[PDB]
Model the fold of this input.
Amino acid sequence: IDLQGQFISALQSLGLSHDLAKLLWLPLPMLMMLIVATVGVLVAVWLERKISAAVQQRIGPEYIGPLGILAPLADGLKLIFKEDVLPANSDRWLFTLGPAVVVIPVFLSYIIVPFGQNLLISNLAMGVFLWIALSSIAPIGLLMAGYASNNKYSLLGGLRAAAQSISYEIPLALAVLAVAMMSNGLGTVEIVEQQSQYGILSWNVWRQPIGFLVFWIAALAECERLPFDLEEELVAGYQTEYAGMKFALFYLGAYVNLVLSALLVSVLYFGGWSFPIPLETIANLLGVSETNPFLQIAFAVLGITMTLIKAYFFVFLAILLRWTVPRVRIDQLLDLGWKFLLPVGLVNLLLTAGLKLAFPVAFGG
Amino acid sequence: TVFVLSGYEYFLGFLIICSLVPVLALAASALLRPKSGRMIRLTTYESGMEPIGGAWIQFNVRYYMFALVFVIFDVETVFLYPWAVAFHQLGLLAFIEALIFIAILVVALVYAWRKRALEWS
Amino acid sequence: PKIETRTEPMVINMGPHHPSMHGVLRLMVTLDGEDVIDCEPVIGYLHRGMEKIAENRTNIMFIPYVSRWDYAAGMFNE
Amino acid sequence: MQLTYVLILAALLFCIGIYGLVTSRNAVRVLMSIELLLNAVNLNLIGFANYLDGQQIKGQVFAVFVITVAAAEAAVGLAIILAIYRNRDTVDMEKFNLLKW
Amino acid sequence: DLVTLAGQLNAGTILPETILIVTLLVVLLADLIQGRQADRWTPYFAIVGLGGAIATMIPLWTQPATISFFGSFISDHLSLFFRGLIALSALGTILMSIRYVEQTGSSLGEFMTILLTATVGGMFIAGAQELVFIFVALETLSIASYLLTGYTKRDSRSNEAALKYLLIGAASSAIFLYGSSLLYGLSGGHTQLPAIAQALSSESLGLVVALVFVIAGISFKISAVPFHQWTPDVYEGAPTPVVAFLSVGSKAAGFALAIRFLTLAFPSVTDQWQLIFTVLAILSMILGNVVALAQTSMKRMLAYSSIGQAGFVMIGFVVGTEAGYASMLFYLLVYLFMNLGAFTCVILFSLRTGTDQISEYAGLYQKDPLLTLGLSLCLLSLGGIPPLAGFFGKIYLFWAGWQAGAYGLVLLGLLTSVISIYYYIRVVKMMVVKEPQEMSEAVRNYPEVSWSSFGLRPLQVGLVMTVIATSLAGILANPLFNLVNTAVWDVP
Amino acid sequence: DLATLTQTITFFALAAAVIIAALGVVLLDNVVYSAFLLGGVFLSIAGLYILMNADFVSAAQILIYVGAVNVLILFAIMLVNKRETYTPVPGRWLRQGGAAVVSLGVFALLTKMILQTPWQLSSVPPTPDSITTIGQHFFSDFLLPFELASVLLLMALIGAVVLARRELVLEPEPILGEEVVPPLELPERPR
Amino acid sequence: FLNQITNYAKEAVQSAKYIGQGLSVTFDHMRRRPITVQYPYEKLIPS
Ligand SMILES: CCCCCCCCCCCCCCCCCC(=O)OC[C@H](CO[C@@H]1O[C@H](CO[C@H]2O[C@H](CO)[C@H](O)[C@H](O)[C@H]2O)[C@H](O)[C@H](O)[C@H]1O)OC(=O)CCCCCCCCCCCCCCCCC
Ligand SMILES: CCCCCCCCCCCCCCCCCC(=O)OC[C@H](CO[C@@H]1O[C@H](CO[C@H]2O[C@H](CO)[C@H](O)[C@H](O)[C@H]2O)[C@H](O)[C@H](O)[C@H]1O)OC(=O)CCCCCCCCCCCCCCCCC
Ligand SMILES: CCCCCCCCCCCCCCCC(=O)OC[C@H](COP(=O)(O)OC[C@@H](O)CO)OC(=O)CCCCCCCCCCCCCCC
Ligand SMILES: CCCCCCCCCCCCCCCC(=O)OC[C@H](COP(=O)(O)OC[C@@H](O)CO)OC(=O)CCCCCCCCCCCCCCC
Ligand SMILES: CCCCCCCCCCCCCCCC(=O)OC[C@H](COP(=O)(O)OC[C@@H](O)CO)OC(=O)CCCCCCCCCCCCCCC
Ligand SMILES: CCCCCCCCCCCCCCCC(=O)OC[C@H](COP(=O)(O)OC[C@@H](O)CO)OC(=O)CCCCCCCCCCCCCCC
Ligand SMILES: CCCCCCCCCCCCCCCC(=O)OC[C@H](COP(=O)(O)OC[C@@H](O)CO)OC(=O)CCCCCCCCCCCCCCC
Ligand SMILES: CC1=C(/C=C/C(C)=C/C=C/C(C)=C/C=C/C=C(C)/C=C/C=C(C)/C=C/C2=C(C)CCCC2(C)C)C(C)(C)CCC1
Ligand SMILES: CC1=C(C/C=C(\C)CCC[C@H](C)CCC[C@H](C)CCCC(C)C)C(=O)c2ccccc2C1=O
Done:
């Protein structure tokens, strides 16, 4: 089936000019992905709060709804009603647009992640470039907000957080390179197709086990899960200067980055829209599956369900390992990063190239 | 010339939609303010007292050196992208020359690691 | 904003809030980078004048004061 | 969309970079206009590889090499600049009048 | 590996550059592992590697001229001669820098890494057929000369000159890169210069604009009259072995790039830039040999003498005969040894005394006769005394200029040489003529007439070898003219 | 008809943004404002590279000239920050007028060169990919600059590490001559 | 020099085993019921 082709045929049967009819079709999924992203953010805030309560043997937020699920919605509806306060400095537009410069590209990078063969936005050539080069912008907004903060401690904390953030970009690119060499492509569709050709025996987690751990450590260092940079040299790193609106924007941006990383790690290594049993055997066992959509709709729902359970598993593992491993210093974190993830990533790329040039049978060829 | 590619209207439309929403949320927060802005006594954030020390930062080199090694390895990663892209029918001499490139940059990393090029003591 | 980075030692004034578990103490830390050179402690935000309380007070009227001397155990002063 | 408007924009960016190389009221804006002067020739090479070149593209390769060269030149220039603040007290270019005839 | 891909790659005309790269890697590894206590075998190992790189060009000399890396590098006798010239410059720079760097205070291996990098860049730019390869090698030499200027570690003169040199070099590199992009856009899309020069016979104004925009960045490297505004400030504040390398190696690299690029790119518009080169030489020789009469600093005097003597080489490039470039190839070969001796004597006089003012030069006939003897025998060769080789170069230069039909250029060159001999003889007048109880201070207490401390013997024997070479090249130059003339007929 | 119309509209808007931001870099009397407008110049020229044909070159443009070069520029700006009063020089108006007429003459000469020299436009469709051919050209035509860029970046990193060291140690050299040389200085002493 | 590398590898595998034991006791802590009280639904008995 094709909903876009049927909508185009219905608008042609109504009578139009085939250009303005096709122009306005894109904003409805372009807003639907945004509203389900805010739905996932409101899911993840309640999930993190209740799982942090269940780890420390207590109950999360209650007496707000049925079980307190409206509490992220109540927080997001209350924090936009607070009085926007400003410090005694200049450049008010810079202080306003700093968090805007932070919030724009991480929200913009939603055109990369897929949910199936057709349930995605853009897969042109190089979606990993459009993730990395857009995620490497937020230090500029962080330094801009630190300069407009007008403080001696918050500016130093913003400098330390920017130096922590820019160091974990190079193994984050090398772990992408180690998979893009084997997949001979930069788009996520070919990467997930080379994993969905076979079942469990074609997963990239068993082919590149060191690169998955390097990418996971780099993601946990980039989304500020284990580095506590929010006791940061007087009280906090880049805080204690904004109002409820800018703090809410930073909180939702951090949760968007966490959700996007938890989706992208599974997509690049484990693989959403996949099954342990191949779909061709089930399609041959059931009947004829080439035009009948009654099984294809259920297969698309099952692929969305597999992507959602993988994202929920990675989110639960990240927020379980937040309070499991103890807090380490940012100097020790930068030292372990630059002394571990770069050399083992380089020799992992070298052994990946050697295994691809030695036996090009089970790899991408 | 003609502009034919895989598509770029989604990127521009999503940029327009994602750039229209933060200033709209800021305008809504300014509209639903309790009274107004323009606080009568504007004070910066100090923990418990008045500013008694000074507005100066000690001259350091650790941030600039980290960003220097970051840009030096980023322009290496940029050159390392298309070799890994075009490694499907190219051969083994390109792998040898990329191994020489990787070994030269590993020698550069060893030179940066041995001396005091990055040290947050 | 006026943040002029110079080549002078930075005086860090830790406020008397300490919002983790500590009370009132104004710590002035003088340093020149990633170390600590000088430290000045300033107190006087919790002094209640207990010695003036016991000037005109008997033994049966001094028990809650002497228990509120130290708020960790208290029974050692009693 | 024609090549002539892109060439006119590249020439105007080159003249803006020339003026910001001459006056600049600073020493970091000199390098910031040097990046504009090289981004003008990057626009020139990208437009030439878009319009004149066909299948075998090489102006994009030259633009990538020019970008890497300008990043290395920016690193060398900032390494030159950051020693002047350690040695001298001021940052103004007009105060450097020691090496006379 | 495959034999067909290795035969189609033709990586056999690259071996001394790979030997120098391996030598750079071994020097960097020895500096990283051992440290500062291994500063007694590393420059001798680099000298051995430079000799092994310059000795393996003899099987490369008797070889047919083939292209390599799919029409990217061209190997001829001219490129081998320029590579040997750059290697002989670098070995003398090492021999003059061994004591000077350790007397400055920095580590020697970190300087020798950038010196070998500049040597590899010069050896790569001695060929440089491809346009992007020309830009990469030129910016490699430019970044090398940037980083070799600020070596004094917060001494004010070098870091005050390095920013001006960075500004002027970045402006010239932007102008040359805009001209290179224009020259790429004028053709159909080709990058190889025989493929570019075939479709450029239309006589457009954009060809002239691109020629001026390329020759501006070229003449910045040659340092002719309209771009000589960096060198009198650069040559004083920079350290002396750095400027001793930059006065000959970068100049020969710019001359080789100018010759090869103009020959392989413009065999149609030669008369348009011949008049420009006559104007540049006429202004440059006059401005150098008139400005250099009034300067009181010795290093600035040699700096302006470099500009005054760089204009004589342009007279051989103005003409179109086959004997014109042979004059430049002989004059650069003489000028290498002349500038090497004139820099070694200044390095010795500045390391044994301190500052090197002109009026301090009195009282050298009694303290050290060998130093003033070498300085006199080198400055007389720089002046044009007929027992020495500089006169033998200038006679061939004026003969080629009068044979091709340039009378006024030879007349102005003779007039500027007659003017320039007055300040060329002034250092000898301060040295060997001044009587006792006339010299200035800090001359009467010379403690170190003997050299026995930390490798002063290679610095002495390099000056001895330079003096013997510039004394024997004047009366005995019969194979040198044949070796020059056998590498000039290949240029069309 | 509509797609070319919106492409020309976005091209004219990006060109106007280039002009106003390049004016705001060199005319505003603040360094951080010129740095942020230079970042806006980088984003606008990245969109202009996206518009015509460039995807990988535009991605490298975004990555380098946003995440590394502009961040290092902002680091050098925030490191060198001190309040000083710019003294009035005796002559600046004639220098600014000379720079203005040089820029105007260069612009007029380049405009005459563009309008005089014609160009040969091609009528062939471009390739749908732009990473495969350039990835093939790094080992067939342009082979030696691929390693000379690495040697150049090695030399630049070595020189920047040398120029960026703190040099906390202090050790005097043995005397060689009459005047003692200070550590990490020049033997050529001024008068 | 190799003994320091083996000691670093032993410290790394010991840190990995400590991280695994922390994950094990964290997964163990999810089995027990919460021991808190509700207010004003489960008020304490005054002695
Ligand atoms: C812990 C974290 C938790 C996370 C949160 C979990 C809780 C939330 C989970 C919710 C599920 C997540 C969101 C689902 C995945 C995103 C799917 C999506 O975005 O998916 C986007 C989809 C579009 O996707 C696919 O798009 C296709 C078009 O693709 C084309 O376009 C695509 C680009 O859009 C690609 O380029 C693709 O290659 C190209 O072919 C077709 O439209 C397919 O039908 C469609 O499935 O948007 C649409 O669904 C269309 C938009 C609605 C339009 C309404 C339909 C129009 C009305 C038609 C009525 C017809 C009436 C006449 C009837 C005739 C009567 C006789
Ligand atoms: C008071 C307020 C009221 C609000 C009113 C709003 C009502 C309307 C919104 C309700 C949405 C919920 C209803 C569920 C609709 C799900 C339809 C579906 O998935 O429709 C499926 C179709 C299938 O799409 C077609 O599917 C085809 C078959 O492919 C599928 O099969 C292939 C097999 O190899 C491949 O795997 C391929 O990737 C996979 O997509 C092709 O892909 C075509 O391109 C594409 O058109 O998707 C489509 O068109 C796109 C449909 C987008 C739906 C995404 C919503 C998320 C799904 C709900 C979450 C699952 C919940 C299920 C709960 C059940 C619990 C037991
Ligand atoms: C909720 C409502 C919100 C409002 C809705 C949003 C409306 C937004 C889009 C309008 C819909 C109609 C137009 C789309 C429909 C449309 O007509 O597009 C289609 C058009 C051409 O597409 P195709 O070539 O596929 O179409 C023709 C083919 O069918 C055959 O040739 O796409 C483009 O022109 C891409 C333009 C991208 C241009 C390059 C990107 C520029 C990015 C610049 C980045 C700048 C950064 C700046 C930083 C300072
Ligand atoms: C980290 C350390 C890096 C140090 C540099 C590494 C050197 C390793 C290889 C040596 C290069 C020379 C090989 C010639 C030595 C030699 O003559 O070998 C012989 C052969 C060339 O033979 P010809 O085909 O010229 O045959 C000559 C005969 O016909 C005459 O009998 O070379 C090869 O087989 C080429 C393949 C080597 C592998 C590819 C090397 C070329 C790429 C290397 C990078 C080149 C640019 C370097 C400068 C930037
Ligand atoms: C066309 C003209 C070309 C001419 C070039 C000249 C070529 C010959 C130059 C040789 C003179 C240099 C040695 C004299 C120096 C000399 O005689 O003095 C000995 C020299 C100085 O030692 P000291 O006396 O300082 O020793 C320490 C003292 O404190 C204890 O007495 O020590 C050496 O052994 C240095 C190591 C030389 C190592 C030589 C290289 C090792 C072999 C390398 C194999 C290389 C393969 C190629 C590279 C991959
Ligand atoms: C191998 C292929 C390349 C060869 C090219 C030749 C380069 C030039 C020669 C340098 C080799 C090393 C000499 C180092 C010299 C060396 O290391 O010291 C050898 C020795 C000085 O050291 P002693 O052994 O006296 O010192 C022992 C110490 O322990 C006392 O402190 O003899 C000297 O007096 C040399 C005097 C300079 C004499 C220079 C003469 C150069 C030859 C000129 C031939 C002229 C022919 C003229 C015809 C008219
Ligand atoms: C099914 C998928 C399961 C994937 C789970 C893996 C995600 C765990 C990543 C750890 C995040 C925290 C990193 C903090 C790590 C931390 O803070 O300590 C790191 C610690 C640093 O120790 P030091 O500070 O002593 O070391 C530096 C000093 O030695 C300076 O000389 O040692 C490491 O460098 C070794 C790292 C091994 C790390 C191993 C991690 C994986 C352990 C779990 C293995 C699971 C196997 C599962 C098989 C089913
Ligand atoms: C068909 C279907 C369905 C179903 C579903 C399902 C069946 C699901 C399930 C599944 C699941 C339910 C999932 C989840 C999971 C999660 C988890 C469970 C996680 C956690 C864990 C962790 C993270 C841990 C860790 C660790 C490690 C790694 C080491 C050792 C130790 C431990 C183990 C602790 C529904 C109804 C929806 C609808 C649609 C369709
Ligand atoms: C290192 C050292 C040596 C060893 C140095 C010796 C081997 C001389 C080295 C000279 C080199 C070999 C000269 C190289 C010759 C070149 C071929 C010349 C070509 C360049 C010219 C154009 C100048 C001594 O002989 C010595 C003697 C007395 C006291 C101290 C020392 C001392 O410290």
Summary: Residues A 23, 27, 31; B 7-9, 11-13, 15-17; F 2-3, 6-7, 10, 40, 43-44, 47, 50-51 surround 1,2-dipalmitoyl-phosphatidyl-glycerole (ligand 3) (CB under 6 Å).
